[PDB]
Amino acid sequence: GGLEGAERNTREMFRWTPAIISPDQQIAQDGTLALSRAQDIVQNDGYAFGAVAIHRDSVVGSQYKLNSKPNSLVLGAPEGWAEEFQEVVEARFNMVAESPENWFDARRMNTLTGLVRLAVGGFIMTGEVLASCEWMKPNGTRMQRRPFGTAIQMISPYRLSNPDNIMDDKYLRSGVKLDEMGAPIGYWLRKAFPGDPTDLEQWRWEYQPARFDWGRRRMIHIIEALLPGQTRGISEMVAALKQMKMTRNFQEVTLQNAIVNATYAAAIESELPSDVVFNQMGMGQTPFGKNIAIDGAKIPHLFPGTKLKMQPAGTPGGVGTDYEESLLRNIAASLGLSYEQFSRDYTKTNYSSARASMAETWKYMESRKKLVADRFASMIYTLWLEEEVNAGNVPLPPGFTWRDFYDPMKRDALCNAEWIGASRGQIDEKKETEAAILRIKNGLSTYEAEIARLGGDFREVFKQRAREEGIIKDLGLDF
Amino acid sequence: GGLEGAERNTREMFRWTPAIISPDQQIAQDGTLALSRAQDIVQNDGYAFGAVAIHRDSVVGSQYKLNSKPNSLVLGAPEGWAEEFQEVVEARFNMVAESPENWFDARRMNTLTGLVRLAVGGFIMTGEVLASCEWMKPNGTRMQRRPFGTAIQMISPYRLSNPDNIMDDKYLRSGVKLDEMGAPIGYWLRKAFPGDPTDLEQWRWEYQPARFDWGRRRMIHIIEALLPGQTRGISEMVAALKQMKMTRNFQEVTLQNAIVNATYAAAIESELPSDVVFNQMGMGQTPFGKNIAIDGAKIPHLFPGTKLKMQPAGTPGGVGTDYEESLLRNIAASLGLSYEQFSRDYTKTNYSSARASMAETWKYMESRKKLVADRFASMIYTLWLEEEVNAGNVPLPPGFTWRDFYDPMKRDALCNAEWIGASRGQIDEKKETEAAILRIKNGLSTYEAEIARLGGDFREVFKQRAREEGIIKDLGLDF
């Protein structure tokens, strides 16, 4: 051959013979070991926990608001219906979405924003979002009333497994039931976490269809595939688990080394007995104007042949140097982060380098957002919207009926949504704001687009400004 | 001759005697080992994984929107028609492509943007985009209801192989069937992944035409041919694989060396028993005011001949230094990346250097986009547009009929489309923005290009700004 890196004739490559292996078989063999190792590292390494928090906060942030994008042209509806639908749905949805009642969570502990945060954080940690679209009976007794029935239960990927540990097949890959095309049609879920001694049911599986008798989702599965034909998610951490673990071992053994070196503040080499030597150094000496009482500035007298070697605490190397910076860079590269975010070290930043790292990392996080968090929350929104449409709590477009919601086009037209996370981050308020103002005033952008960059949707902002101007006017304030 | 660099006369070049090997013979003879080594290094190094992510996010980003450019002239179309067709086609296509339903993906797991990202990542990792245009009948059972039949199965380049492992020939080069002029006419695909111990049919191959019938595309194959006469792609990693693996080995063995030198915090050399020596050092001492409990600082008394040697953890060299920088820079040179993106080391940057690197890498990524991502999506768009023209959802120009879609010139006139990825960074905002505004107002550009540089679509932006201006006017606001 002529390709140097694709041959074994080379001393550097003779031993590198990786196996031809399917991604699904990588997951089947490695699988739970990667999940457990990633969870371990996240739960025992501060940098990884922080990275998870950074993913949560950059992708989603403090809020995850709905902006509804009804595709009027597919629906043929007039430009003037859409604004009413947007108003009504955004109000009704965001109200219960941000509500502390946790309506959307079957466990009633996470707000929608919190559900999305949990998904994203698990994604980097597990490689996939796995959730069930439970149903909690609405219009029940007053003590258990609900505005809507749909609820989400986020599932541990450990529970997704082939029933009774059978080997995988063309139509069954690590717990996923596949059609002939490879499309997931249903998932095999252990009724409880594996190995959990508190639940006897963990011995058993249940099969949950991805789609109901109609295309309504009963299960939510999301991955960002690396290889063609991959159907189970492999976490980004897997590329770095070795580096993360060995970096942690390095940090800890370095810290132990430092401590050990600092404890032995001195050493005597003496042929005297210990009781004499330490008495020379202040043992048993009372402090006044086998533990030595420090009082101050002693001058010991040591017989010749007794050597007092003082061993002051040196600076332990490696950690805090460019080396450990490089390790953390290698990791953050897999986690999609900038060294500054991952390591919390901005010592060597400047306005341009900070801005460049922000641009790269924002590209990555906007990708994760629009391809994991937006899909997840949109799967939730389409369910809530199915409920409201069948109930007629929303303004249907001319000629529409809740039965048309089964038409993929007419459905995706309404369920189309854009999601406003927190503000995008703003390293320089003055300059970036003037840029946005320029882009608006010169037509290069919408208010909706910029105000979303600022963490809001433009219409409530304009309503609030209307209220503020009415208040200002009747007060007579000349601003 | 006189060319010292193409002669074996010199001491340096005597042994360098490379084989004259056909490109396809390189792919055949080495080949799969390049794929395995590339996916290995990607799945076991954070830097390569980050590089793949950077490709996906730089080439494609968070969105991949259609901007149809119907060549009204060669269609002989009248004024005004192009706007109506563009409106309808983009309204439908972007809506379905960004839908969480995963219409275009036969696995029903990736949106269109995700398919393009998956190609781009597989490209860098395999040199090839390989996909099958599947057909799933629309308007079947409700749960199977689809808006269109076009589906794309992304295919593992391992499955593209000569049937029954026969040797290649004039008309059959590593799985690709060739005409007399070397053009691909069909592809020989294993039924399933090779060596998958999950299904039996992997012993069998399937020939799939490249052009199903009457112009329609049954399969998609894309490569960046380095050499003439090349029909299979070679990953741009292959120049780097040796360097990647050896720098990985260097990083890891350096880390092991560091951890080892840190572990042995000290040594005692003594003809004393170990039990005695460690007792001198604090073994068994109870910590208040088999292993040593530290309790504050200590002063051991050691008998003469017992040298206590402190061995504090030193800084490991190589990694973190300019040496590792040069290695990662070599690799970045092959992957088309800047050292900063690849390594995330944005310390030694300044505005002009950052801008220069950004431009250098943007040229590469724009080239990759147009040559790989835009062609893939354009093929998908032609397949979808075929369905839409047959169904009559899109307004055809006067005199055009669904049979004219066979005419290569008119077919290519309609299918002509540009694609909008995520925004082009805009590192130094308010300067890039002022630049775009001046470029527009002085006529050196148009809203189409600049807003696309901002990740938006101009016509939708103008509609939304019309809505915003109407709302402002109705609320009586003055921004």
Q: For residue B381, what is the enclosing H or E element?
A: helix B374-391
* Main-chain dihedrals φ then ψ at residue B92, nearest 5 degrees: -70, -50
Chain A residue with the nearest C-alpha to that of B105:
A183
A190–chain B nearest CA distance, Å = 22
Answer whether A260 sits within 8 Å of B234, measured CB to CB.
no
In three-state secondary structure terms, B171 is coil
Q: Which residues 6+ apart lie within 8 Å of B40 measured at CB? A: A16, A18
B414, B53 contact by CB (below 8 A)? no
Q: What is the dihedral of CA B86, B92, B96, B98, to 10 degrees?
A: 40
Chain A residue with the nearest C-alpha to that of B297:
A263
* Residue A105 DSSP code: B
Smallest CA-to-CA distance from B306 within B281, B343, B342 is with: B281
Q: What radius of gyration, in Å, describes the C-alpha atoms of chain B? A: 31
Answer whether A226 sits within 8 Å of B19, measured CB to CB.
no
Compute CA distances A248 → A51, A53, A121, B345, whole Å: 15, 19, 21, 21
Answer whether A184 sits within 8 Å of B308, measured CB to CB.
no
Smallest CA-to-CA distance from B237 within B346, B124, B355 is with: B124
Smallest CA-to-CA distance from A240 within A357, A322, A318, A327 is with: A327
Compute CA distances A37 → A197, A242, A347, B53, B288, whole Å: 21, 10, 31, 22, 37
Token pair recorded at residue B340? 């900063």
Q: Using CA atoms, how far apart are residues A339 and B39, in angstroms rounded to an integer?
A: 25
Residues of chain A positioned with their CB less than 8 A from the CB of B440 = 442, 444
Chain A residue with the nearest C-alpha to that of B448:
A444
Task: Give the largest CA-CA distance in chain A.
Answer: 107
Strands A266-269 and B301-302: parallel
Residues of chain A positioned with their CB less than 8 A from the CB of B39 = 18, 227
- End-to-end CA separation in angstroms for chain B: 77
Smallest CA-to-CA distance from A381 within A253, A231, A230, A220 is with: A220
Q: Using CA atoms, how far apart are residues A187 and B7, in angstroms rounded to an integer?
A: 64
B6–chain A nearest CA distance, Å = 17
In three-state secondary structure terms, A425 is coil
Answer whether A261 sits within 8 Å of B265, measured CB to CB.
yes
Smallest CA-to-CA distance from A305 within A335, A336, A280 is with: A280
Residues of chain B positioned with their CB less than 8 A from the CB of A448 = 464, 468
B209, B2 contact by CB (below 8 A)? no
Q: What is the DSSP string of B385-435?
A: HHHHHHHT-S-PPTT--TTGGGSHHHHHHHH-EEEE-S----SSTTTHHHH
Cβ density class A123-146: b for 16+ within 10 Å, e for less: bbbbbbbbbbbeeeeeeeeeeeee
* Residue B233 DSSP code: -
Token pair recorded at residue B264? 């042995």
Q: Using CA atoms, how far apart are residues B122 and A368, in angstroms rounded to an integer?
A: 18
* Main-chain dihedrals φ then ψ at residue B215, nearest 5 degrees: 95, -30
Residues of chain A positioned with their CB less than 8 A from the CB of B471 = 459, 462
Chain A residue with the nearest C-alpha to that of B244:
A5
Q: Which residues 6+ apart lie within 8 Å of A240 measured at CB? A: A330, A331, A334, A335, B46, B49
Answer whether A226 sits within 8 Å of B429, measured CB to CB.
no
Q: Using CA atoms, how far apart are residues B37 and B42, in angstroms rounded to an integer?
A: 8
Q: Using CA atoms, how far apart are residues B466 and B442, in angstroms rounded to an integer?
A: 24
Q: What is the DSSP string of A194-259?
A: TT-TT-GGGG-EEEEESB-SSS-BSEEEEE--SSTT--S---GGGGTHHHHHHHHHHHHHHHHHHH
Q: What radius of gyration, in Å, describes the C-alpha atoms of chain A? A: 31
Q: For residue B249, what is the enclosing H or E element?
A: helix B241-263
Residue type, A463: K
| Residue from the list B122, B294, B351 with its beta carbon closest to the beta carbon of A352 | B351
| Residues β-bridged to residue A95 | none
Q: Which residues 6+ apart lie within 8 Å of B140 measured at CB? A: B146
Q: In what order do the strands lie in the sheet with A172-173?
A: A172-173, A176-178, A184-190, A205-209
Handedness of CA B61, B347, B433, A418 (dihedral sign): positive
Answer whether A458 sits within 8 Å of B468, measured CB to CB.
yes
Smallest CA-to-CA distance from B297 within A259, A273, A298, A279 is with: A259
Q: What is the DSSP string of B314-378?
A: PPPSSTTSHHHHHHHHHHHHHHT--HHHHH---SS--HHHHHHHHHHHHHHHHHHIIIIIHHHHH
B237, B334 contact by CB (below 8 A)? yes
Q: Using CA atoms, how far apart are residues B443 and B436, in angstroms rounded to an integer?
A: 10
Residues of chain A positioned with their CB less than 8 A from the CB of B19 = 1-2
Chain B residue with the nearest C-alpha to that of A318:
B315
* Main-chain dihedrals φ then ψ at residue B282, nearest 5 degrees: 120, 10
Tokens 């009415």 belong to residue: A470
B184–chain A nearest CA distance, Å = 22
Q: Using CA atoms, how far apart are residues B46 and A339, in angstroms rounded to an integer?
A: 13
Residues of chain B positioned with their CB less than 8 A from the CB of A416 = 95, 98-99
Strands B172-173 and B176-178: antiparallel
Answer whether A407 sits within 8 Å of B303, measured CB to CB.
no
Residues of chain B positioned with their CB less than 8 A from the CB of A339 = 344-346
Q: Using CA atoms, how far apart are residues A164 and A349, in angstroms rounded to an integer?
A: 54
CB atoms within 10 A of CB B279: 15
* Residue A272 DSSP code: S
Answer whether A20 sits within 8 Å of B314, measured CB to CB.
no
Smallest CA-to-CA distance from B455 within A61, A355, A453 is with: A453
Residues of chain A positioned with their CB less than 8 A from the CB of B151 = 181
Answer whether A466 sits within 8 Å of B475, measured CB to CB.
yes
Smallest CA-to-CA distance from B165 within B183, B186, B190, B198 is with: B190
Answer whether A258 sits within 8 Å of B32, measured CB to CB.
no
Angle between helices B46-55 and B32-44 (to 10 degrees): 100
Q: Using CA atoms, how far apart are residues B297 and B177, in angstroms rounded to an integer?
A: 77
Q: Using CA atoms, how far apart are residues B126 and A330, in angstroms rounded to an integer?
A: 23
Residue-level length of chain B: 479
Q: Using CA atoms, how far apart are residues A419 and A60, in angstroms rounded to an integer?
A: 9
In three-state secondary structure terms, A169 is strand
Handedness of CA A281, A287, A293, A295 (dihedral sign): negative
Q: Using CA atoms, how far apart are residues A184 and A131, in angstroms rounded to an integer?
A: 14
* Main-chain dihedrals φ then ψ at residue B120, nearest 5 degrees: -55, -40
Residues of chain B positioned with their CB less than 8 A from the CB of A352 = 349-351, 354, 427-428
A258, A265 contact by CB (below 8 A)? no
* Residue B239 DSSP code: G
Answer whether B46 sits within 8 Å of A260, measured CB to CB.
no
Q: Using CA atoms, how far apart are residues B239 and B235, in angstroms rounded to an integer?
A: 8
Token pair recorded at residue B338? 């800047």
| Residue from the list B263, B301, B343 with its beta carbon closest to the beta carbon of A270 | B301
B245, B40 contact by CB (below 8 A)? no
| Residue from the list A318, A435, A465 with its beta carbon closest to the beta carbon of B315 | A318
Tokens 């609405």 belong to residue: A138
| Residues β-bridged to residue A169 | A172
Angle at A186 between CA A181 and CA A187, to 5 degrees: 120
Burial grade of B108 (CB within 10 A; 0-12, 13-18, 19 or more)? buried
Residue type, A281: M
Angle between helices A32-44 and A112-126 (to 10 degrees): 110
| Residues β-bridged to residue A152 | A105
Token pair recorded at residue B207? 């020939």
Compute CA distances B62 → B53, B231, B421, whole Å: 12, 31, 7
Q: Which residues 6+ apart lie within 8 Å of B74 measured at CB? A: B409, B410, B413
In three-state secondary structure terms, B309 is strand
Task: Count helices and strands (H / E) in chain A.
Answer: 16, 11
Instruction: Calculate the CA B346 to chain-centre distance.
Output: 22
Smallest CA-to-CA distance from A117 within A88, A97, A87 is with: A97
Query: DSSP 3-state helix, strand, coil percentages of chain B (rounded to 5)?
Result: 45, 10, 40
Q: Which residues 6+ apart lie within 8 Å of A265 measured at CB? A: A310, A311, A312, A313, B297, B298, B299
Answer whether B40 sits within 8 Å of A21, measured CB to CB.
no
Q: Using CA atoms, how far apart are residues B378 and B116, in angstroms rounded to an integer?
A: 11
Strands A128-132 and A219-223: antiparallel
Residues of chain A positioned with their CB less than 8 A from the CB of B447 = 443-444
In three-state secondary structure terms, B153 is strand
Token pair recorded at residue A104? 């959307």
Q: For residue B260, what is the enclosing H or E element?
A: helix B241-263
